[PDB]
Every structure is written in C-alpha cells, then in structure tokens.
Symmetry: C3
Subunit: 321 residues, 3 copies
C-alpha cells in the first residue's frame, strides 16, 4: 500500500544520499610546496649572562626545509651555542647537576637532562657554584627559555603555496589541486577564496583559533587538511579540495613531555686545527599536509547487492502489516 511506496522511497533515497550505487575507492596524494617570505631579526638576547645583539636577514634557505613526507618546517625561533668542541666541562647548573662535593658525581653517569658523561668530579661552573664535570661538546648549552618574542616572529606573514595531485587508480582518473588558468594571485580565505592554494600562515592559525606568536615562541605542529569528495558519474560531477586547518601538537606545557616543536641542529667546522661545532636549538612550526578523500563511480555489482538487500524490505515490509 502506501507504506510500500514509503519503503521504496526511503530505500531508494538511502541509495541516492548514501551513494550506494557507487563503488568508492581511496585516493593517492602527492604534495609539493613552495614557501615564500623573509624575516629580519633585530633582537637582544642574553648569552651566558651578558647581553648580545642578534641581527640578520633570513631567507628561504635559512629557515625552511623541502617537503619530506607531505610536511614542511618553518623555523620561528632559535638559541645558538657557538664554538663547542669535544672536551671536559662543568655541566650547566640545574637541580640535577649541582654538586656539593665529588660524592655527588659518579664517573660514567648519564642523565636524560644532561648532554654529557660525568667524569666523577665536582667542579665550579661559576663563582662558588659547583656542578658535576662531564665529558661532552663543551661548553654545554645553557638551560634557558627560547627568546621572549620569537626571533622569527614575522613568519606569520609567510606564504605556503601547496600543489596537490590526486589519482584514483581503479577508476583511472587523475586530477590536481590547481585547475588550469586560475588567477594564482590571491590569499586563501574560507569564503572569499576557497580554492586559492596560497595560504598565509597567520591566516591558518586564526582559522584554528591559535595565536601564531605563542606557538612561534616554542614551536608547534599544525595540520593542513585537504579533503577530496569526488563524484565520477557525470550526471553529478564534483571533485575539488576542501581546505581545513587543525592544530596537531598536544599543547601539554609539561617539561616532562617535551612541549612545542624543536630540534638540535649541528654545524660542524674546523678551527685552529680543532674539531668544532656550533649547536643551534631550532624552534618552529611543522605543517603536516593531510590529503584524504574518496572517489565514487556507479557499480552494477554494488547497485545489485544493494537491491538484494532491498527486496527483503519489499517482502518483509509486506509481511509487517
């Protein structure tokens, strides 16, 4: 009766809306990014208790790294420990490193917080303050915070140009993030330019509602999501990206869980016939470009199997009344 027409209607609807006539294949993604922008570093940092003038112009080669694994990194802050060489030196004053006597130092001791192996001697670091002498790259990098305003704070004004190429192998269909002939000069805006592949980093942090400066002080991990909802039927054809932004780092703020994003980068060189090293603690934001999607095209066997689930609601819907 009428309930049968409503069962046919709701069933065929669930078919249409849920695209069950379609077979759905996962996508294959390739990413290629070009980061643009420079930054001028004028700041006053404190090195070893003394004030020091940090200046210099930073371009692409000085703060970024080519995209490896659908992700790129933009340095936003740094601490620089210059002139290190293999030797013996008192470890940096810390609750774990301070020693009253040689009894507080055990030869061969290693500590997660330290970067050296103890010799077993208690030596003076400054004045009457004593720390356990270690063998390491000397002098030891100080335990301090990253610069109070991030040295490369201007990075929010930088631009990332993203090129995404997706392919569905089963359906033999290839398409790319940028269709031909589009006006490339634009900034991505949620509404004004939803297809602009040019992203201002500050814009991204506003979309996720995080402040770029705060994250820039100690680093973070941001996420650029490129969603691909795709239809390959022709009766309704659509297959373009949807750009969303999600902040990926944990924001723990606990010294035990290593917050932010940073890494220790070495620059080796020789000086006065001695092996030497300039260690730079590098702070910045890692952007992770996550491309996910599904491509649909009608399958007879799928539409069949669905019908086979559906005739049982024809008959069973008849048996209900």
């Amino acid at each position: 009766w009428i309930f049968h027409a409503l069962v046919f209607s709701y069933i065929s609807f669930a078919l249409i809306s849920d695209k069950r006539y379609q077979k759905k294949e996962p996508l294959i993604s390739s990413v290629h990014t070009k980061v643009k922008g420079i930054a001028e570093v004028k700041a006053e940092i404190l090195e070893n208790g003394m004030k020091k003038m940090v200046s210099g112009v930073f371009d692409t080669a000085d703060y970024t790294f080519p995209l490896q694994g659908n992700s790129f990194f933009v340095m936003t802050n740094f601490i620089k420990t210059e002139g290190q060489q293999q030797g013996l030196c008192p470890d940096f004053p810390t609750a774990r490193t301070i020693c009253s006597s040689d009894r507080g130092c055990k030869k061969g001791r290693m500590d997660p917080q330290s970067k050296g192996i103890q010799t077993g001697r208690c030596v003076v670091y400054k004045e009457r303050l004593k720390t356990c002498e270690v063998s390491a790259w000397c002098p030891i990098e100080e335990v301090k915070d990253a610069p109070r305003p991030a040295l490369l704070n201007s990075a929010e004004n930088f631009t990332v140009l993203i090129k995404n190429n997706i392919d569905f192998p089963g359906h033999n269909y290839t398409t790319r993030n940028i269709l031909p002939g589009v006006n490339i000069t634009c900034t991505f805006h949620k509404t004004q330019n939803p297809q602009c592949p040019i992203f201002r980093l500050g814009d991204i942090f506003q979309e996720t509602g995080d402040s770029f400066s705060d994250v820039a002080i100690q680093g973070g991990i941001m996420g650029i999501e490129i969603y691909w909802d795709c239809n390959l039927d022709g009766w309704f054809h659509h297959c373009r990206p949807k750009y969303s932004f999600r902040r990926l780092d944990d924001k723990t703020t606990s010294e035990s869980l290593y917050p932010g994003y940073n890494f220790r980068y070495a620059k080796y060189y020789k000086e006065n016939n001695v092996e030497k090293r300039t260690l730079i603690k590098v702070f910045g934001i890692r952007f992770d470009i996550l491309v996910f999607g599904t491509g649909g095209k009608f399958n007879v066997i799928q539409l069949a199997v669905y019908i086979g689930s559906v005739i049982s609601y024809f008959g069973l819907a008849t048996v209900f009344i």
Copy 2:
C-alpha cells in the same frame, strides 16, 4: 526455469569475479631505495656576465638524499652563488627592482621576487642602471635560467634499486618486493623484466613518455607506482607488485606558479672572521614511490551477507516472470 539458472549463474559469477566471498584489507608499505651512478660535469656557465668553467665529479653524496617518506631526490642541475654575507647591496635588475630615483624605494619594503628588505635608497647595480638597495645575503643571486643543457644530464643513466615491504595486519601476512634467490642483475623492462626492482631513470621517463633532458633542466616530480593485487586463498594465490610510472608535476610553464622542482640550499662557512654563505639553487627530479594495494581472503560473514543479497534475486527473479 532457465532465467533462474542464469540469475544463479550471473550472481555467482559476480561473486567470483568481484571476489565478494573475500574480505579485503588495505596494505602497509615500507620503502628503501639505493641510488647508484655518478656524473661528470664539464660545462661552461655564465656568472655575472663572465664565462666560467664548471667541472667536477659528482657521486651519490653530492646529488641525492636518503628516502624520506617513500620518496627520494636526484639533483640534475644547479646554479651556484658563492661568497654571500649579510649586508647591503643593490637588488638584481628586474622589472620590479629597477628604480629611477630614491622615490621608487620604500624603506622596509619586501617583495615576493626579492630576497631582501629595502633600505629605501636607489643605487647603481651596473653602469647607470639602478636598483633598490636591499639588506640581505649579498650579492643577490642573479635572475637567470638554469644551465641550457642540465649540468647533471647523465642522471638518466642512474639506477634506483627499490625495496618494498608490505604487510596485511588483519590477515597476519608479510611479503616483500624481492622474493629470495632472484637474479638481481637486470634492468626493469615492462615485458622483459616486470619483476626487476632495478629501474633506470631514463627508462622511467620513456615509459611515461616524458623527455628526461627537458625535465632535468628545471626539475620535475615523477611517480613510481607499485600496485599490489593479492589473493590469500590458496585455491588461487597471487601477490606480486605491478610497476607503473606516472609524471606527477603539473607542467604549468608559468612563472607565477613556480614550475619544475628546485630548492634553495645554503652552505654556511666562516671566512676572514666573517659569517659567509654559499647559496646553491638545486634543480632535480623528486621520485615519489606510491605503494597501494588490497589483500583478500574469504570471509564467512561476507559470503553470508552476499548470499543474503542474493536470495532476494532468487525470489524476486521468480516474481519477475
């Protein structure tokens, strides 16, 4: 009647062909590549208007980068700007950089095309030609094209050895790209050696129909696809790779969309007690190894559910006549 036997036959066929008795799980891929080959660079390049002799032998450490994220890079061309140091200098003559007077330069101006921050002064670059003086790594890298024949043109003769390891966790089945005891000495050929994991790069560009030289001049992004169609039933067992090749870069040829593949690599050093930098614009092909596949093994619940869609064509096929 006969239509019922044809419905059972077409249904059970769709089962067999579409492997619907089988549950299908996605694969997990690990890649490990070893690139072999060297190249001799004898060429004459033009630096700052003057001819210069570019020579040298390039081995693995000089042109490639270990595989990060199922992809490896092979440099094929380069422009080298040596001796840069932080300072002030006239920007390179360009439609956007040429100034008639100090009125064309605004102090603090930054430009996507430039690598510096303007001081607000109009200075001479050469002769009577004036550009806006900038603060940057000086001298500025010239605006020129990459060498006319690619300096590392020999890269087409290089070899990539690919090692792929796939695992299906649900089915607890692990297999690798190279089965034991195979004659490793071979070049992959579509027909003569379809299982050779040794790929000549030129061969790859011929398969995709792109010329290796052209792409090598300004760089590109190529794609090595490893398809895994796999059957874990035993009645029919097959699970080997299918190597296909697809060119991934967009081939735009528009100065606004940054064509090819290149990146700006810095080499820092100290000289005459001055912080100095040799900037190399690096051109090459990025190879993206895309491993996709599906592993099938018969599922009772799946075969069931399919039968449950199928009995409705038994009965409904009876009701049709």
Copy 3:
C-alpha cells in the same frame, strides 16, 4: 522453529561480533618523536692499514635526524674518509679494479662498484699492486667492513618518545596517543606498561627477537606499529593504541642487494684554497612508525542493508526445512 531462532541468533551475532551495525572509517595519523640518549665512542679503527684512535661524545645532534614521513633514523656505526678533493687517483684495489696494464683501463669507464670515471691509465695503488686511475673525490673510500663492534653500540640504551595524533574526519573525532595526566616516567613493557609511549630501542629488538648489536653493525630498518581499534558508540567505548614491533629490512646478506641500512653523507669545506670534502659512510637503524586503524560508529543505512541481507535468511531458512 528452533533452527529459525538459531539463524536469528547466529545472524545477529555475526552482526554484533563483526560490528556490521557500525560504519567504519580509516584514521588520519600524525607522528612526533623525541629521541634521548648519548654515546661515548672509544674504539680503535684501521684506516689505510694503520691503527687509529676513534674517540668522542655523541649527542642528539650528532646521530639522529628529525622525523620525516613518520620515521626517524639513529646512526649506530660509521666509516670516515677525510680530506677528499676533486682529482685523479688509483681506484681502491678490488677484483674489478685491479689492472695488469693500461689495457685493463678504458678512458671514460664507469662501474657500479667504483666512485670515479677512469682516465684509461693503470697506476700503482700500493707497492706493485696496480688499479685503474679514476677521476673522482680523492682518495677513494676504502672497501672495508663496518667497525667490528658498532661504534655507537650504546644506541640500544637510547629512548624514543612517540606522540601520535589520530583523527577521524567523517566522525569528527580527534584523539592522541597520550591521554592527559599519565605518569610519563616509564619504559614501555608489553605487559607492565602497554600504554607507555617511551620505548627503549633494545627492548624493541628483543620484542622482535633480533639482536640489536648485529643490526647495529651494518644497519637495519625496524618497524613500530601503532594499531588503533576504536569504537565510538558509547555503549562500548574503546580507542587506544596497541604497540607492536616488526623488523622491516630484508636481512638478505648478499653483497649484490646492498644489505643493512647506510648512506653516504658529505661534509664540504675549504682548505688551503681548495674545495674539500669529508665523506662519512653512515650506518644505523631507521625506525618506521606505522599507524593504522579503523573507527566505528553505528550507521542506520548500514544496519539496514545488513537486515536486508538477513531477512533472506529468515525466509530462505524457512524454505530449507
């Protein structure tokens, strides 16, 4: 009759166990690792036939590389060829390089085993032993084995801290590897600490049953699997990682298939106004963090379609008797 209740029971069971009422979406993973530990290298290596003292303290910046593509590398051994410069030199004595006369050397010949291009001359390498003179980075790196105990053998005591963030976009559900407030100080143990994100590398090799020392001599590729079985219904809620460990390298032990894991890292520098290079053959373990999983939440259309397969066993189960 009773067989109908057993068909309803086995069917509804297959529903419950196989979670067919649930729609299942694949996960999105982001990884962030921090490696901790240092190593002291005291060893005696043989360079060019003469004994040499290898010593030095190695920290994070000296042996690891930030996580690129859900994978990180820990160097465990190395051979160091210092002072190389572009020139001519006899290739290293090898079955393929040894020449009786200039007839054994062809000008322009390149060989997979060699790192140079032959000049076509047969010269003395040592004493009366002759090899084919090549143009390359000179002197050529010796053909030898990696140090007999791995120089960075202590790497098994190192620690990897893994931070995984997964997201299901369709279900709008985000969760991370580390829930808040957990006691971070711990070592992952299969039973004692199944949720500890802190992994000792030696522990990992014991779990996979490989010896860390052996692999550390010539390198390897290990696999850290993070499985995510997840339920988003609330009636039964569970969504945590399962850490498993699988050794990914092929363990071929054949000189033709490049066993282990190693790469040739160049350190360029200038000396006596000559372009020079220190080549280091780097041996270590690459860890591949493989995050896979599935998130389930009940779907009306799915539960429907299943019922539609099921009523045909109601009726067909009736027709069987």
